[model samples]
Target: MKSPEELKGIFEKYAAKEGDPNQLSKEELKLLLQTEFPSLLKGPSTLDELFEELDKNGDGEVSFEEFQVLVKKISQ
Candidate 1:
């Protein structure tokens, strides 16, 4: 499992890649998954499916606050 600081670094790195500096676009999310959380994509759902599920609130962007759920999942 990663430390909260490590996760924050990861989130900040990707979230700042394009649009908002505090939110992740799908493309950012894809890159994040491909690098930091590859195992997540190995599950039954494709990136699209998983993103849709994780995106929560249908904002089309995943905020760091919204991203906490993924941290919990991966830690488990």
Candidate 2:
């Protein structure tokens, strides 16, 4: 995503798949990682770990803002 607008669009698209339209379920995160950042999953970390890491509040779901953690990591 080049800008916040673009990121918002992708977030909306993926988040709308199931569960909350404003939050990413683990399943949605799976697809997002697989398609948007395959290399992210190539390391030793499991999706469960990634989800828990991003779910800062332990809410069991990731918001767009929380997802930005990965965005910032990849952007770096």
Candidate 3:
């Protein structure tokens, strides 16, 4: 299997896949979590909680930057 750093690097190199190109969205995170980091996301119980936590504007979504921070902080 690939090392954790290699896997993380591969995951980080992807662009924002949040369905739309303008506003902050969750599609990218959703895809990445569901496909690559399933265990890290804990199935789905706390997915919404995380989303809400990062959606500081209370706008019901997360931006690419927000997502990057969240993913980077997953282990910490």
Candidate 4:
């Protein structure tokens, strides 16, 4: 598992790809997962489901605060 700091850095790295640059769009999240946690994609849940779960505020994009759930997922 990566440290919290490392995870935050990774989040920022991908989150900055496009859109808000401070949020994780579905595309950005897809790229991040495919590149960093490919195995997570192999699980039963689909990207659409994952994105829905992560976007807690339902704002259509995931802020860093909302991205914390993914950190826990990665840790587990």
* Candidate 1 lDDT by residue in tens digits, 1-76: 8899999999999999998878999999999999988998898999888878878899899988788888876898
Query: Rank by TM-score, descending?
Result: 4, 1, 2, 3
Task: Work out the TM-score per prediction.
Answer: 0.89, 0.88, 0.52, 0.92
Model 1: lDDT of residue 24:
92
What is the RMSD, in Å, between candidate 3 and the native fold over all Cα?
Answer: 4.7
Which residue pairs of candidate 2 clash? none
Worst 10 residues of 2 by lDDT: 1-10
Q: How accurate is candidate 3 locally (lDDT)?
A: 0.58
Count backbone clashes in candidate 4: 0
Judged by lDDT, which candidate is best? 4
Please report how far candidate 1 places residue 53 from its true position, in Å.
1.2
- At residue 64, what lDDT does model 4 achieve? 83
The lDDT-based order of candidates, best leading, equals 4, 1, 2, 3
Q: Name the regions of candidate 1 deviating beyond 4 angstroms.
A: none
lDDT of 3 by residue, 10-74 (tens): 45544334444433455555666677667757745577676677777786656555555655545
Best by TM-score: 4
Scanning candidate 3 in windows of ten residues, the lowest lDDT window is 14-23
* lDDT of model 3, residue 45: 51
Tell me the alpha-carbon RMSD of every candidate. Answer: 1.2, 1.3, 4.7, 1.0
